[PDB]
């Protein structure tokens, strides 16, 4: 009897939505209109049958102040949570102009229409409510079509972002205008109106920003608990709206909009397994909200609205549908000159798509339902719902159905030739794979008698899309084929975790843009915008770093004055005193009690005494040097005011005390601002490194590919020249970014290193799990310890102080792990310094010693650049012959210099563990061996990272143990030569030094003359 | 003002649970007790502060009939949805005895205690409510501990299943006994009580079964719509409980229990991406329910319960906690003799774990809250909540905390040596991988200056666990090492999709069992239980197949009599008439109206006329043969009754009409029963094929492994003998299963073939996506078309009629794709037949022709067996020399025979497309080449499937084009010899025919003498 009947209607709507969504899947009509018809049916039968009324009443006639608080957060957050925020930011101004100003004109024009055309004789407030609910649009279908058809980035996000902002502001306007119709207030003082505007417009986004930054902070500290992450997201979403709208009178919708957008941006703080869950979770909740709303409309529209219609109302409906359509187009075209300059710009065809795709829906209907409940017996609620519902139906029946054909007409739905080629190739390879698999199964004793006619038909996959003049387009083939290769390399790096998605999309966008521009190649100056740091943050860092420059100053009191515990406790003491500060003012306001005032003022005296005591300790610690710092001068003012107020009207105390301790807390606040600024720079700088990395590695790989793909050498040379001229510019730019922000660069580099180690570490877990040497449960146990570390990686400090040179030597590849060897060369070492533009070494110079870059950049000339950590001379010291390249510093340089004579002693003394010479040779071997193997298979599916790891498993042969090296391929897969020359066993031909040994080679005869020591590199097969 | 305040409390409890679950993570105390303390705090402050009362009232004092309808479905379904059902079924009786009978004794004993010990003077009804809520247990923590510690399968599922059943029945008992206290009824007739019992006990599970089978049916037909799958699951879950409890008065909890269990069993009908979502989704909902309930308890217990406590109540609490503990142990021990026989049996230590781990919780508390609301001012609600809450606290404070130490004491928490070894090896390999990765990064120009001291520390992974007498244990090493290898192979097959999880767990369970038994090896007779079909289903199939044996009978009326459209429409006509049948009875019952009765009786006359017309058509079609079938005899009785009722008290009509059309519908019902029976056999048979496959492939792989791992040949021979003696028995059993159920076997084989093709087809999609030749969106588009087909695979008919022999030839590997060649040999072919035990061919026989098995089994003797589809003679016809093995039929056999003379003509005539001889050689090459490569790398991570595919890419060399074959390794990775012999180019040594060419071999010189045609197989490198 007392059961929750709402479970029936909610679950019933679930079934009805499933049915409508399953039947009308391949049909053009959207499933939502079917749901409206079903709700209307429920309404007519429920109008006579009493039994079903009881199971529909509690939801069909649900209160509006609950409709808003429950559904709108779901719809708005889901719309925000589904955004491609990065794109939305790269078009923010274009959206704001159309969504905000376009909304005002669209609604007002719609309002004047409703005042003048209709016979309802509405006033401007009601007409503005009408226009507000008319302007709200939910283009969930059109955006899907564009997403499927391609070329969606510059249009789908615009309509999606415009939709989000338009609903967000429309609710704001609707809330504003509902109150001057149903909740009229008489005060209407102008000053409060400005204050009223500030709350909804300004405080809302700020409330959401604060809640978001708090939320991500905790989420970044939750490890191995998915339920809590999901639960935190839910509670934050609903509390943000509820608190903002109900307790703060702040705009809930905008707070959620910002909160969803901020969280979407900060998804890295969320565990990936929860991220995928949340999207599908909020999508499901939005689906339920949509399905409910349409059915409630279908019920009430039939019970209450359609019974009060008049004959002419249909005339207004058609006219209104036409009006909003031309209104939207006029608005879009009117702003079009402005948009052409701001953002990507609108073509006339794209403008029509936005105009034609302005679908209405749940948000408009939800606000109409609010009016229906609020109007009661007034006709307005009926006709608001009538026209809102009708326009939703027409847009769904006409615009949602003809949009595909219109896209065909405009030539936008056409699949580009590259995509047709990709699909044809993919289908062909898949078809061959099945044929191979089919023959294998027919040879299986278990499956020999399966009905292959059924099998082949069931598994088949089908294509869903079923001279100067010569140079003028031969170059186009070179451009497109190079650009296509670049796109491939970017996808490679992304799939192996070397590259973030944001950098990948930036690179791909630039490649696509360059392809369309007829004579264009991808341009570094366009890429430079990614890593060029905006000056505000560096200026703020430089400025704030001065405010804590304690170096002007920097017997137990002297120790206590500097002890961190004392400072932290004093700061805390000030923090607690803030509660009395506000409490006294609030108590005075409420009193205007004495028992409370006396307690507070006694507490004030106690705090004055405490402040005197701590200041006395500080003064005793520093003596006359105490007052050197302006911070301590205000600390003296603290005692002045404390003594004055101890001796002794209320305002004279309030005004001084309100400033004292806020200012004294600013000192502890500044470092956090420094950290935040470092974080912003770290984010921008990290993306710059990724993009510069992507382009550099992309060019390095592509240069191997194009060398054999393009037919004409003249075309080849022009393209390769571009590649190097861009690569060196990027390298220089990225090297210089380090010097401006050393610590942040170190943080970036460390984070990449750990992330790369963990990724490959994770891969091994799946290797043995796939190999069965480790079970499912235990492998999962290890994988979690990896995952938590990855999350801990995010919380790494935004700035790491650069290690001193004495620590750099310890971490060198050929020095690490041998303390005695580290000490020997460290003791023998000396540190040099060089001025700007100075030459360090030059072509033909004797190799008298070795260099390590501890600071600065150096240009070489086969031009290249190097920076901190890079060793120079690792070959000359070994080959013992003149230096191979010039070394010029592009900035002031510091280097650790080891004289060749001392190093030679270290070389011929440190050989117990793997030989020092062997290690130095190994570093050289990998360096110059990588390009050879990359050339040999860059056109295949490998990346240079795996070539390095492929080589990393290898080692140098101990040639001293044999006069010759004979090949084998069972336990050996690749071999390269580095130094010296060998004689072929069969043909007696010589093989040159930096050459890969062809697989037709067997056995190599070396010789032990003193001119050179031949060096050879092998990688043993798995 | 009118906002939904409940959003605050729900979201507030979310935050409080997050806090408590985050702080008390590493502590021993569970987080739930912390939540209770927090709720108590909220209660005391809310008792004075009015503001927070308003935000706690609407939930803290929520109605009970909503508490049950909302939370219990979530808790019960989640507990059911989380089960390992297969294990739960393999222990169902053991759980039922303990959970059902143990519950009755545990509660009654608890009730007598409450009647006699306590001073409350309860009557048996109230005391039974007490015992019911006391017996409910939620061992969510203990099961987690066992899951982590290992050896959990035979104990965790028992406590989990016992818990599920105990809560399910406890609610049933609580519902029963609440009604005789708060809703007393006076009728109490015995006959209704039995009817009342039937509804709750019998109809509930049936209601859930019907809803489940309907649900999975639709879910199996939903393609590419995840939201609808999730939504359907939700609505089905809540409607099942709501309809069952409210409309049918049926036991909702048990219906949901069955529904959750059935759905969990039928998870294959659900898309995998939705399956993973649902578990985390229902887990989250259960988490919310738990967190809410504890806080509502903490609130009300402080407001209303604790204010009415007496001093002695604590004495009863302690005594009660002791009593239920010894009661549970006495029950477990008392049934222990029975359990030792039924199921796995209980050790004394395992019994204590069950006794000690009997934690109470939300379910007990939820039912106590119901009493608190219902008791009103009566003390009983206070003390019910007091003792329930206290026992929950004590079990959580004591049992949940000491359980780990007790497990240590009993020696159950000890990590077995094999797991320690696996963890040490896994950690070591991971540690080496990071070291390799670290050195690679130090050579990177971008990351050379990262603080490696930070990196190495952050990425490090640490071990979490930180003669006759010789023969008597050398054999143990052989046993364990063989058994360990078997376990590895099973994991291999599972990870590549060749093996289902159920078969994998069965095999692993048997391996573990055999390991513990001192002298045991895995035994086929133990495996036989998997594929031995229970006779009920074959008997039912055989019986029902007779009832539709139309062959006793099987001018337009003759055609119409057999047309399917006429039969379907007639059956539909009968289906519609059922509505009048029930409608007349219901109308008569309600009347006891005439305007309705006349319409129904007129409809009865019309339906009588229609039935006469259709029968007239049938009789005209068959003439005097019409009455030959008993179905048509009752069809004549239909006309008899129709004419009698047309001419003409109400009972005389009801009784006849109630039978006529139900019986006439049974005819259309029988085929569906046939299909269902086929489905049950298909499921059991499919698992048998998988397990037999797993053991056969496992033994084949292991025999390659152990041949070099065990040191003693005598041990080796004994182990290998076991392997073959099991393999041949399994092969024979699986071959014979086919003959008993040909069509179902064909369905199984076809389903495996398609699933294997799609899996490898899916793999290619990720290959190019990882290689970047296909983009993220388009690759995803193709992958969906693959996924939908996989779901369509489930709906494939359970039985496929075996194709006739004329279709078998077309699908042979070396015949397919060449119609003219198919026709030639098909025309030349002849079909033979052989009797049981007949010899087909024998050792030393001349190869006069070739055989193909179209029916039956054949034994060979290197013993082996073959069955349908297997060709025999594929070498003798080629080598043209005597036959190599005996061929004896183990059952009646049919074979397609091609005489060698005709085939030779086909061989030397069909050579335009790839040579017929080349194809026959290829089939032989793969067959005998696979074992060689398996031997060469079985100890590595490969499976024989990939060896076949590794070979499938290869081909036979065209030796006719060269006197010699010189090796290369850049575009070639493996080569094998099949026929003939070659001479080494370097050493001039001969290499034998069925031998892999060692990687030290270069160039092979063949000769063209007429004795043999040498054959060589190559696989080109990627």
From Swiss-Prot, chains A, B:
Region (Transport core domain): 92-179, 312-410
Activity sensitivity to pH: Optimum pH is 6.5.
Localisation per UniProt entry: Cell projection, Cilium, Flagellum membrane
Effect of residue 655 to Q: Alters the half-maximal activation voltage of gating current. Shifts the activation of the transporter to more negative voltages
Motif Essential for sodium:proton exchange location, chain numbering: 166-167
Main location class: membrane
Annotated 3',5'-cyclic AMP binding sites: 873, 875-876, 883-884
Residues annotated as binding a 1,2-diacylglycero-3-phosphate: 2
All ranges on the Cytoplasmic side of the membrane: 26-30, 82-91, 150-152, 222-225, 266-272, 342-347, 411-563, 621-628, 675-1022
Region named S4 segment of voltage sensor domain: 649-709
Catalytic reaction(s) noted: Na(+)(in) + H(+)(out) = Na(+)(out) + H(+)(in)
Residues in coiled coil: none
A GO term, aspect molecular function: potassium:proton antiporter activity
Region Interacts with the transport core domain: start-end pairs: 501-516
Keywords: Antiport, Cell membrane, Cell projection, Cilium, Fertilization, Flagellum, Ion transport, Membrane, Signal, Sodium, Sodium transport, Transmembrane, Transmembrane helix, Transport
Segments crossing the lipid bilayer: 6-25, 31-48, 65-81, 92-117, 124-149, 153-178, 190-221, 226-248, 252-265, 273-306, 312-341, 348-375, 380-410, 564-592, 593-620, 629-648, 649-674
Family recorded in the similarity comment: Belongs to the monovalent cation:proton antiporter 1 (CPA1) transporter (TC 2.A.36) family.
Assembly and oligomerization: Homodimer; the dimerization is stabilized in the presence of phosphatidic acids.
Free-text domain note: The dimer domain comprises TM1-TM3 and TM8-TM10 regions. The dimerization interface is formed predominantly by tight interactions between TM1 on one protomer and TM8 on the other. It contains an hydrophobic cavity that accomodates phosphatidic acids likely playing an allosteric role.
Free-text function comment from the UniProt entry: Electroneutral sodium:proton antiporter that regulates intracellular pH of sperm along with capacitation and fertility. Activated in response to egg-derived chemoattractants, couples membrane voltage to sodium:proton exchange and transduces membrane hyperpolarization to cytoplasmic alkalization to cAMP signaling and ultimately to sperm motility.
Protein's recorded name: Sperm-specific sodium:proton exchanger
Source organism per UniProt: Strongylocentrotus purpuratus
